[PDB]
Protein backbone atom coordinates (compact mmCIF):
# COMPACT_ATOMS: atom_id res chain seq x y z
CA UNK A 1 0.00 0.00 0.00
CA UNK A 2 0.91 3.66 -0.31
CA UNK A 3 2.41 5.57 2.59
CA UNK A 4 -0.80 7.63 3.02
CA UNK A 5 -2.92 4.45 3.20
CA UNK A 6 -0.55 2.93 5.78
CA UNK A 7 -0.69 6.12 7.86
CA UNK A 8 -4.53 6.02 7.70
CA UNK A 9 -4.49 2.34 8.73
CA UNK A 10 -2.01 3.20 11.52
CA UNK A 11 -4.34 5.99 12.73
CA UNK A 12 -7.34 3.60 12.76
CA UNK A 13 -5.40 1.10 14.91
CA UNK A 14 -4.41 3.86 17.35
CA UNK A 15 -8.13 4.76 17.64
CA UNK A 16 -8.95 1.10 18.38
CA UNK A 17 -6.19 0.99 21.02
CA UNK A 18 -7.49 4.21 22.61
CA UNK A 19 -11.01 2.76 22.82
CA UNK A 20 -9.74 -0.42 24.49
CA UNK A 21 -7.75 1.64 27.04
CA UNK A 22 -10.75 3.85 27.89
CA UNK A 23 -12.94 0.76 28.48
CA UNK A 24 -10.23 -1.51 30.05
CA UNK B 1 -5.32 14.83 5.05
CA UNK B 2 -1.60 15.74 4.46
CA UNK B 3 1.22 13.43 5.72
CA UNK B 4 2.48 15.98 8.24
CA UNK B 5 -1.07 16.56 9.50
CA UNK B 6 -1.91 12.80 9.67
CA UNK B 7 1.40 12.30 11.49
CA UNK B 8 0.45 15.06 14.02
CA UNK B 9 -2.83 13.26 14.76
CA UNK B 10 -0.94 9.95 15.26
CA UNK B 11 1.66 11.65 17.45
CA UNK B 12 -1.13 13.31 19.45
CA UNK B 13 -2.76 9.91 20.31
CA UNK B 14 0.59 8.27 21.20
CA UNK B 15 1.40 10.94 23.80
CA UNK B 16 -2.15 10.56 25.18
CA UNK B 17 -1.66 6.75 25.41
CA UNK B 18 1.87 7.04 26.86
CA UNK B 19 0.75 9.51 29.54
CA UNK B 20 -2.09 7.26 30.72
CA UNK B 21 0.10 4.21 31.14
CA UNK B 22 3.05 5.99 32.93
CA UNK B 23 0.99 7.78 35.60
CA UNK B 24 -2.75 7.14 35.63
CA UNK B 25 -2.62 3.35 35.83
CA UNK B 26 -2.21 1.99 39.38
CA UNK C 1 18.38 7.02 9.49
CA UNK C 2 19.46 4.33 7.02
CA UNK C 3 16.08 2.49 6.98
CA UNK C 4 13.52 3.45 4.29
CA UNK C 5 10.23 5.13 5.39
CA UNK C 6 8.33 2.05 4.24
CA UNK C 7 10.53 -0.29 6.31
CA UNK C 8 10.04 1.99 9.32
CA UNK C 9 6.29 1.93 8.62
CA UNK C 10 6.29 -1.96 8.66
CA UNK C 11 8.07 -1.95 12.04
CA UNK C 12 5.47 0.51 13.38
CA UNK C 13 2.61 -1.67 12.02
CA UNK C 14 4.09 -4.78 13.71
CA UNK C 15 4.37 -2.98 17.06
CA UNK C 16 0.80 -1.72 16.74
CA UNK C 17 -0.44 -5.31 16.15
CA UNK C 18 1.44 -6.64 19.16
CA UNK C 19 0.09 -3.79 21.26
CA UNK C 20 -3.55 -4.51 20.11
CA UNK C 21 -3.16 -8.28 20.68
CA UNK C 22 -1.93 -7.77 24.22
CA UNK C 23 -4.66 -5.20 24.91
CA UNK C 24 -7.52 -7.48 23.62
CA UNK C 25 -6.36 -10.35 25.87
CA UNK C 26 -6.80 -8.38 29.11
CA UNK D 1 5.42 20.04 11.82
CA UNK D 2 8.97 21.39 11.80
CA UNK D 3 10.68 17.98 12.05
CA UNK D 4 11.08 15.73 9.00
CA UNK D 5 8.81 12.77 8.30
CA UNK D 6 11.64 10.24 8.82
CA UNK D 7 12.52 11.72 12.24
CA UNK D 8 8.86 11.93 13.28
CA UNK D 9 8.28 8.33 12.27
CA UNK D 10 11.38 7.20 14.33
CA UNK D 11 10.01 9.16 17.33
CA UNK D 12 6.62 7.51 16.79
CA UNK D 13 8.37 4.14 16.63
CA UNK D 14 10.12 4.84 19.98
CA UNK D 15 6.89 5.77 21.75
CA UNK D 16 5.27 2.59 20.46
CA UNK D 17 8.15 0.52 22.07
CA UNK D 18 7.59 2.34 25.39
CA UNK D 19 3.84 1.66 25.21
CA UNK D 20 4.40 -2.07 24.55
CA UNK D 21 6.75 -2.34 27.55
CA UNK D 22 4.28 -0.57 29.86
CA UNK D 23 1.32 -2.74 28.78
CA UNK D 24 3.19 -5.99 29.40
CA UNK D 25 4.18 -5.01 32.98
CA UNK D 26 0.53 -4.37 34.05
Author numbering:
A (entry chain D): 170 to 193
B (entry chain C): 170 to 195
C (entry chain A), D (entry chain B): 168 to 193
Tell me, in the authors' exact words, what the paper reports.
The essential polymerase cofactor P from Pneumoviridae is a multifunctional hub which interacts with numerous components of the viral RNA-synthesis machinery. Pneumoviral P interacts with both L and the nucleocapsid, thereby tethering the polymerase to its template. In HMPV and RSV a central oligomerization domain facilitates the formation of P tetramers. In summary, we have shown that HMPV P is a highly dynamic protein that is composed of a stable helical tetramerization domain flanked by large N-terminal and C-terminal IDRs that sample a large volume in solution and display varying degrees of preformed structural elements.
Although we were not able to grow crystals of a complex, crystals which later proved to harbour only the P oligomerization region could be obtained after extended time periods. Serendipitously, we obtained two additional crystal forms of Pcore with improved resolution, allowing us to build a higher quality model (100% Ramachandran favoured). The first crystal (form 1, space group P21) diffracted to a resolution of 1.6 Å, while the second crystal (form 2, space group P212121) gave rise to diffraction data up to 2.2 Å. The P212121 crystal (form 2) grew at 20 °C after between 132 and 185 days with mother liquor containing 25% PEG 3350, 200 mM MgCl, and 100 mM Tris, pH 8.5. Diffraction data were recorded on beamlines I03 (P21 crystal) and I04 (P212121 crystal) at Diamond Light Source, Didcot, UK. In one of the tetramers within crystal form 2 we observed a single, solvent-exposed helix which possessed markedly blurred electron density and, as a result, significantly higher crystallographic B-factors than the three other protomers of the coiled-coil (white arrow). This suggests that, in absence of packing constraints within the crystal (as is the case for this solvent-exposed helix), the protomers of the Pcore region are somewhat flexible and there is a certain degree of malleability of the tetramer interface. Alignment of all six tetramers from crystal forms 1 and 2 and the original crystal confirmed that there are small-scale breathing motions within the coiled-coil. This is fully consistent with the overall lower buried surface area (~4800 Å) and predicted dissociation energy (~21 kcal/mol) for HMPV P than in the more extended paramyxoviral coiled-coil oligomerization domains. For comparison, the buried surface area and predicted dissociation energy of the Nipah virus P oligomerization domain have been reported to lie between 15000–20000 Å and 140–200 kcal/mol. These data indicate a flexibly associated tetramer of HMPV P protomers.
